[PDB]
Amino acid sequence: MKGDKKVIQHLNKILGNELIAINQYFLHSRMWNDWGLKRLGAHEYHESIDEMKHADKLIERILFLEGLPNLQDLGKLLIGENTQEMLQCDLNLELKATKDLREAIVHCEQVHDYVSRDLLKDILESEEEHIDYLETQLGLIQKVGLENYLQSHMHE
Amino acid sequence: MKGDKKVIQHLNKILGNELIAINQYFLHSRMWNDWGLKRLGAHEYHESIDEMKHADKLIERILFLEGLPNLQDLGKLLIGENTQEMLQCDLNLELKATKDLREAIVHCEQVHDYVSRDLLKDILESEEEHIDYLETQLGLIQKVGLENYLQSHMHE
Amino acid sequence: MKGDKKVIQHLNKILGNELIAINQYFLHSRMWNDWGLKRLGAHEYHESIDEMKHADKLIERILFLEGLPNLQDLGKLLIGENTQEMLQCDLNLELKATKDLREAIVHCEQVHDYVSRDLLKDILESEEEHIDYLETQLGLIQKVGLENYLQSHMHE
Amino acid sequence: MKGDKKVIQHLNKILGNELIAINQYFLHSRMWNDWGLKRLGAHEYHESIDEMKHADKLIERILFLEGLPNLQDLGKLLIGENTQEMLQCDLNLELKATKDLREAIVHCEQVHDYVSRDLLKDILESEEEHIDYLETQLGLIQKVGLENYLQSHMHE
Amino acid sequence: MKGDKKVIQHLNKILGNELIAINQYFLHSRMWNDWGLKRLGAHEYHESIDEMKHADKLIERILFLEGLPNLQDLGKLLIGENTQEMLQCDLNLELKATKDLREAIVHCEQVHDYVSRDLLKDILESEEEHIDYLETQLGLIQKVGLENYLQSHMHE
Amino acid sequence: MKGDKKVIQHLNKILGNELIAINQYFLHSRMWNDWGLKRLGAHEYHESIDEMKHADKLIERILFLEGLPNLQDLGKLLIGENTQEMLQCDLNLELKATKDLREAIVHCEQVHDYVSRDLLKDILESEEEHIDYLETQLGLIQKVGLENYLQSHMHE
Amino acid sequence: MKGDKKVIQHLNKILGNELIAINQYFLHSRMWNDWGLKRLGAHEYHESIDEMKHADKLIERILFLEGLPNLQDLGKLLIGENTQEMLQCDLNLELKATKDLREAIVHCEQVHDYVSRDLLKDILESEEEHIDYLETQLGLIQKVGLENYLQSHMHE
Ligand code: HEM
Ligand code: HEM
Ligand code: HEM
Ligand code: HEM
Ligand SMILES: O=C1NC(=O)c2c(NCc3cc(Br)ccc3O)cccc21
Ligand SMILES: O=C1NC(=O)c2c(NCc3cc(Br)ccc3O)cccc21
Ligand SMILES: O=C1NC(=O)c2c(NCc3cc(Br)ccc3O)cccc21
Ligand SMILES: O=C1NC(=O)c2c(NCc3cc(Br)ccc3O)cccc21
Ligand SMILES: O=C1NC(=O)c2c(NCc3cc(Br)ccc3O)cccc21
Ligand SMILES: O=C1NC(=O)c2c(NCc3cc(Br)ccc3O)cccc21
Ligand SMILES: [K+]
Ligand SMILES: [K+]
Ligand code: NA
Ligand code: NA
Ligand code: NA
Ligand code: NA
Ligand code: NA
Ligand code: NA
Ligand code: NA
Ligand code: NA
Ligand code: NA
Ligand code: NA
Ligand code: NA
Ligand code: NA
Ligand code: NA
């Protein structure tokens, strides 16, 4: 079904954000596991898988609309070097991702692509859940202290 | 069955205290959950449900006694700004509530409304259990430190 | 995640309506049980629980958006004196609720808070189901007669 | 297998009656459900489904006999404005349907299409059962009164 | 609950499209079965049932909104004479249906009938899934050839 | 445990090939699914997952050796426009990957990193299985013809 | 089957290292249990058993190759005096073990004793896993602090 060219461009932009997030979260997961923070490692692994599932749905939608999914142009990964910075890097990425999701939804609404809008709304709900998790973890570091926060994430 | 007018007034006063407690405990529960202190959030949620069940019984008793349950007047919620204050706000409310329960029981006894006394005694037992929990949490903060206390309430 | 101030005010307004409905439906439920109309009491009890669940979701969203949920202000309960009036009181409350939900959704759309819109739309779907239930009960009273209508709601 | 041209015309007339009945019974079902007469709504839904099954068999037989099943020409639906009228509308349709079935069977017998006759006989047995149901309900309205009759069909 | 007059007109227009699709798909299903292409026949039967379920939901919504569901006016069925035409006839009908769904959603949004919009959006998702299936079948006829494509749809 | 710098560079080169293959095979999978060739889509999906698992093991090994896994550089994806070209693009990538695996094993052996050698040997075994699959599919297309080959990959 | 003399000497050197590790890890295990650090005690017990299993396989190989397994000569145990030192003592022993394994594999390869090489490679993989565990524990001490680290290893 021929889709709106600019909708397809938005979908490819959201896809690109998901492709960044997949790799950033996967690497953060394996860094945390390497450091013995296996509860963080496991949670971040599931965050990466969730992004993989969003990217799948976006690829499938682009193809149905007769566009070409762009899996080639990988943007900048935000890789932290300590737990607090890794969480902040994930949060910064998610905040960019939700800004792009909102702009894409606006355009879907204007050209009446209501199914594309609904997919993007579902993705946006998942990313706002991720923002909640991230903001909460950063708050917990402040409340319980870094050493306790890390201690509580050693064991899965 | 026509009940004593002042018994009904006493029951409506206890119900008013329970209505405050429901909302105060529910809000504290959701604040703790938002902050990631999910063991506190869950325990406080169960406190709120317990007050809901007490309010239900009071409403049912008032109607059997041919009175009008007062769900319209809501007194002042005591909302803390951090974990220590929230626990103290709950404890301050509970101590007011047990004072009012004791005065209500005195009056039921004097007009021979022994069934209402028995209900109020059961509610009082629950409120004293809640006081014990609250006093114990405040003591633990002193014994293990606030940071450890909070750490121990992150995970259910 | 910092939300739009006016979204939060709308969410608190909706929460305010839900808090009225919780108490109004709970009281109506217990009145109907006291009168031996236990099928009405059970159904109205589940309406009250449904509003509690909506209130929970709203409180949770407000906190995520870094607002203060308002559980302190309780508006006017509409309590009937007989079954027909109680049903009409519930219907009047629900018509106000859905008007306010629609205005809140307009605003969420304008500021691109698509997740708050989606929550409010789900609540609106539940309230329209409640409106259908209430309109249908008032119509059944006309079709079968008040005495038959009440008879059919004696046993659960 | 080439069928008799007039048999196929008869089968298409029967099919035409079933297509009216499907829609008429389906709309009546959903009207009764909307009014809270769920027992009537459920029963009328099952009547609609049964006519769908008859239409299916007629379509299949016509195609086997190398005719064109007419799903395009929808005759007049008889929709009532209250329960008694809806039942009477269904009954009037059924009495027309059984008259056309009998005429179709006469012709099948004359041209030795005994398999088409057997199918129409089975459909006719179903339609006479539906007539029994409808006549019985109209008789019950008189025997128990309309208010009781409707009361007995509120709940499934 | 009194609905917007033009919403109701749009819902009846969507319903009319569904009623065409029910009959068109059912007839195509039974033609394919008659030809021994039972896998196509079974799939097309399920498409017809899906349209039956959408029609049901639209009828229910129109009645709740105090409108009259139009099951009397049946538009033009697009019936093909071979597999390739039957699939293209279904796709042509689906593309008109989605145009009409988009225009209905625009109006629902303008008058704040967000629950009707949500219903139409769900139906639109189902119709886009049907378009995907249909476009894919026409593409497979090209990629595997017509004889293979038909061969692969003989047996369930 | 600090690893040999050139081993880590080889591991990152292998990881780079796996990252290309993940995306290429995932896109090919979803292209085949969009075209209705779901058996090809499923098989190619499982090849993508396999490469994901290889990439995971490489990331973990590089971190253990105190290197930085390179998930930022993505080389050129080879995306075909039809089934034969897609298979040949996968085969070309695999043949580059196995060449690079062999050079890396030579260097692991020279510096006595026998565990890295063993991991790369296991990956090489998987890639030679993939080469077998691809070469075999290309041979089958020649033996049974493209139309039959695609027909046999329509259904899982 | 008569083995290479120097291969057997290498196997006996590896066995010598395993015999040290068995005793060193078993004593550290029982020290940690005595101190109430039972999670460390259990984990170190399992490391000791793993070394027992490697020693068994080496003894079995030496005897097959017609050599005499040396269980008489026990080298210097590295026993720590606190948790940090004990983990470091284990790590120091493991790093010497892996050096000796690599040198043994070199010789096995040169004289074509590929089965002995394979056994030593499997042991080497286990010892590198043990090095990963130890380095990770020493890193956790730095990140969570010694008091938290020990706290986390009190209970199993
Ligand atoms: C650094 C790149 C990637 C890594 C390291 C990676 C890793 C993984 C792993 C380890 C799994 C679990 C497999 C299993 O054990 O069953 C997985 C699953 C999956 N991946 Fe990836 N992946 C990557 C990229 C992608 C991309 C780019 C996509 C889509 C475009 C994707 C889509 C999926 C899907 C759909 C699943 C299945 C999840 C489920 O339902 O359980 N992945 N990935
Ligand atoms: C007059 C005030 C209230 C009364 C009398 C009341 C009563 C009840 C009762 C009897 C229950 C079921 C307990 C059980 O299953 O044993 C319940 C459940 C619940 N209440 Fe309330 N309640 C009130 C107010 C509230 C408020 C203001 C909230 C705010 C969120 C709330 C949230 C809940 C929730 C989330 C449940 C669980 C429902 C479920 O998932 O089953 N309640 N309430
Ligand atoms: C107003 C038009 C129609 C409506 C609203 C309607 C509605 C329905 C519904 C809701 C179902 C059950 C779906 C489920 O399983 O949940 C159904 C089943 C069915 N319909 Fe229809 N339908 C319509 C027209 C037709 C027509 C015209 C035919 C044949 C030409 C037909 C044949 C069938 C059959 C064979 C079944 C399955 C019966 C069984 O359970 O064995 N329907 N219909
Ligand atoms: C201080 C010296 C040692 C101690 C305290 C020790 C202790 C133990 C214990 C407690 C068990 C498990 C007993 C059970 O509950 O079944 C065990 C198992 C075993 N030990 Fe030792 N051991 C020592 C030395 C050795 C040596 C020198 C060897 C071989 C060279 C060895 C080989 C084994 C084997 C093969 C097992 C079987 C465990 C399994 O796979 O289930 N041990 N040892
Ligand atoms: O919280 C409240 N509890 C109440 O009973 C109530 C109200 N009662 C209405 C009423 C009902 C009867 Br039957 C007889 C007299 C009468 O005034 C009105 C507003 C708020 C409340
Ligand atoms: O219903 C109510 N919801 C509320 O948030 C609330 C109150 N807030 C206390 C508070 C908490 C924080 Br943290 C930051 C500021 C602040 O004022 C007080 C009374 C009643 C209510
Ligand atoms: O209700 C209807 N039943 C029908 O068969 C039908 C139509 N048939 C199309 C057709 C198919 C073939 Br193969 C050969 C001739 C032919 O006309 C067209 C419109 C409406 C209907
Ligand atoms: O397709 C049709 N949908 C309909 O509602 C309908 C008809 N309705 C009769 C009716 C019922 C009521 Br209650 C109120 C007004 C009213 O006119 C009659 C013929 C055909 C149709
Ligand atoms: O693909 C990537 N793999 C990575 O490790 C990585 C990054 N690492 C940050 C980093 C840099 C240095 Br210098 C030392 C330690 C360190 O953690 C940053 C961007 C992209 C990537
Ligand atoms: O650790 C030890 N391993 C051993 O095999 C061993 C000993 N074996 C004596 C022996 C047995 C045979 Br059969 C053939 C030759 C031979 O000298 C004696 C003392 C200590 C050890
Ligand atoms: K601690
Ligand atoms: K009666
Ligand atoms: Na939070
Ligand atoms: Na956590
Ligand atoms: Na506790
Ligand atoms: Na009573
Ligand atoms: Na109704
Ligand atoms: Na009822
Ligand atoms: Na009946
Ligand atoms: Na045939
Ligand atoms: Na397609
Ligand atoms: Na198929
Ligand atoms: Na195959
Ligand atoms: Na490590
Ligand atoms: Na540990």
PDB file of N, CA and C in Angstrom, chain B residues 2 11 13 19 26 32 36 41 45 47-48 51 65 77 79 88 95 97 109 121 130 132 135 138 143 151:
ATOM      1  N   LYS B   2     -33.136   1.083  64.743  1.00  0.00           N
ATOM      2  CA  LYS B   2     -32.738   2.465  64.989  1.00  0.00           C
ATOM      3  C   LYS B   2     -31.599   2.498  66.000  1.00  0.00           C
ATOM      4  N   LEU B  11     -19.521   6.831  64.852  1.00  0.00           N
ATOM      5  CA  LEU B  11     -19.162   6.011  63.696  1.00  0.00           C
ATOM      6  C   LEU B  11     -18.783   6.878  62.494  1.00  0.00           C
ATOM      7  N   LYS B  13     -17.528   9.877  62.643  1.00  0.00           N
ATOM      8  CA  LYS B  13     -16.210  10.430  62.929  1.00  0.00           C
ATOM      9  C   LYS B  13     -15.092   9.429  62.632  1.00  0.00           C
ATOM     10  N   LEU B  19     -11.431   7.694  55.894  1.00  0.00           N
ATOM     11  CA  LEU B  19     -11.394   8.295  54.554  1.00  0.00           C
ATOM     12  C   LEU B  19     -10.128   9.123  54.333  1.00  0.00           C
ATOM     13  N   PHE B  26      -2.853   5.851  50.215  1.00  0.00           N
ATOM     14  CA  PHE B  26      -2.746   5.566  48.790  1.00  0.00           C
ATOM     15  C   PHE B  26      -1.745   6.497  48.108  1.00  0.00           C
ATOM     16  N   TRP B  32       6.032   6.438  46.894  1.00  0.00           N
ATOM     17  CA  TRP B  32       7.119   5.494  47.113  1.00  0.00           C
ATOM     18  C   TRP B  32       7.372   4.654  45.866  1.00  0.00           C
ATOM     19  N   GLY B  36      10.779   4.399  43.297  1.00  0.00           N
ATOM     20  CA  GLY B  36      11.470   3.139  43.238  1.00  0.00           C
ATOM     21  C   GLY B  36      11.601   2.423  44.561  1.00  0.00           C
ATOM     22  N   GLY B  41       6.140   1.031  48.941  1.00  0.00           N
ATOM     23  CA  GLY B  41       4.935   1.293  48.171  1.00  0.00           C
ATOM     24  C   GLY B  41       3.913   0.181  48.300  1.00  0.00           C
ATOM     25  N   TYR B  45       0.336   0.430  50.195  1.00  0.00           N
ATOM     26  CA  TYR B  45      -0.855   0.073  49.431  1.00  0.00           C
ATOM     27  C   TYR B  45      -1.753  -0.852  50.240  1.00  0.00           C
ATOM     28  N   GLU B  47      -1.834  -1.099  53.501  1.00  0.00           N
ATOM     29  CA  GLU B  47      -2.446  -0.286  54.552  1.00  0.00           C
ATOM     30  C   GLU B  47      -3.681   0.452  54.038  1.00  0.00           C
ATOM     31  N   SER B  48      -3.603   1.016  52.829  1.00  0.00           N
ATOM     32  CA  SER B  48      -4.734   1.756  52.290  1.00  0.00           C
ATOM     33  C   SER B  48      -5.929   0.838  52.068  1.00  0.00           C
ATOM     34  N   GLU B  51      -7.696   0.138  55.311  1.00  0.00           N
ATOM     35  CA  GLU B  51      -8.585   1.224  55.739  1.00  0.00           C
ATOM     36  C   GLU B  51      -9.865   1.238  54.917  1.00  0.00           C
ATOM     37  N   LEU B  65     -28.013   0.837  61.269  1.00  0.00           N
ATOM     38  CA  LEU B  65     -28.524   1.612  62.392  1.00  0.00           C
ATOM     39  C   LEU B  65     -29.369   2.807  61.946  1.00  0.00           C
ATOM     40  N   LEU B  77      -5.398  15.833  54.791  1.00  0.00           N
ATOM     41  CA  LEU B  77      -4.394  14.814  54.525  1.00  0.00           C
ATOM     42  C   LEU B  77      -3.034  15.309  54.998  1.00  0.00           C
ATOM     43  N   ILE B  79       0.542  14.823  54.146  1.00  0.00           N
ATOM     44  CA  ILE B  79       1.405  14.274  53.091  1.00  0.00           C
ATOM     45  C   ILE B  79       2.840  14.683  53.394  1.00  0.00           C
ATOM     46  N   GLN B  88       6.119   9.563  59.595  1.00  0.00           N
ATOM     47  CA  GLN B  88       5.651  10.306  60.764  1.00  0.00           C
ATOM     48  C   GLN B  88       4.241  10.852  60.559  1.00  0.00           C
ATOM     49  N   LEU B  95      -2.422   7.983  65.518  1.00  0.00           N
ATOM     50  CA  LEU B  95      -2.594   8.294  66.936  1.00  0.00           C
ATOM     51  C   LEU B  95      -3.861   9.097  67.173  1.00  0.00           C
ATOM     52  N   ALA B  97      -6.453   8.704  65.235  1.00  0.00           N
ATOM     53  CA  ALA B  97      -7.515   7.747  64.961  1.00  0.00           C
ATOM     54  C   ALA B  97      -7.785   6.845  66.168  1.00  0.00           C
ATOM     55  N   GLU B 109     -20.303   1.392  74.670  1.00  0.00           N
ATOM     56  CA  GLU B 109     -20.489   0.628  75.890  1.00  0.00           C
ATOM     57  C   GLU B 109     -21.605   1.227  76.736  1.00  0.00           C
ATOM     58  N   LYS B 121     -13.513  -2.241  68.250  1.00  0.00           N
ATOM     59  CA  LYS B 121     -12.368  -2.907  68.856  1.00  0.00           C
ATOM     60  C   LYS B 121     -11.531  -3.624  67.803  1.00  0.00           C
ATOM     61  N   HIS B 130      -0.798  -1.163  62.882  1.00  0.00           N
ATOM     62  CA  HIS B 130      -0.196  -0.192  61.971  1.00  0.00           C
ATOM     63  C   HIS B 130       0.742   0.743  62.719  1.00  0.00           C
ATOM     64  N   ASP B 132       2.447  -0.047  65.385  1.00  0.00           N
ATOM     65  CA  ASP B 132       3.664  -0.808  65.639  1.00  0.00           C
ATOM     66  C   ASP B 132       4.575  -0.839  64.410  1.00  0.00           C
ATOM     67  N   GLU B 135       6.140   2.846  64.037  1.00  0.00           N
ATOM     68  CA  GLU B 135       7.159   3.082  65.049  1.00  0.00           C
ATOM     69  C   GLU B 135       8.394   2.250  64.781  1.00  0.00           C
ATOM     70  N   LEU B 138      10.427   3.760  61.856  1.00  0.00           N
ATOM     71  CA  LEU B 138      11.152   4.946  62.300  1.00  0.00           C
ATOM     72  C   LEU B 138      12.339   4.563  63.165  1.00  0.00           C
ATOM     73  N   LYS B 143      18.488   2.836  63.530  1.00  0.00           N
ATOM     74  CA  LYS B 143      19.428   1.756  63.804  1.00  0.00           C
ATOM     75  C   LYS B 143      20.316   1.438  62.606  1.00  0.00           C
ATOM     76  N   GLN B 151      17.515   1.503  50.994  1.00  0.00           N
ATOM     77  CA  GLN B 151      17.991   0.410  50.149  1.00  0.00           C
ATOM     78  C   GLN B 151      17.188  -0.859  50.387  1.00  0.00           C
TER      79      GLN B 151
END
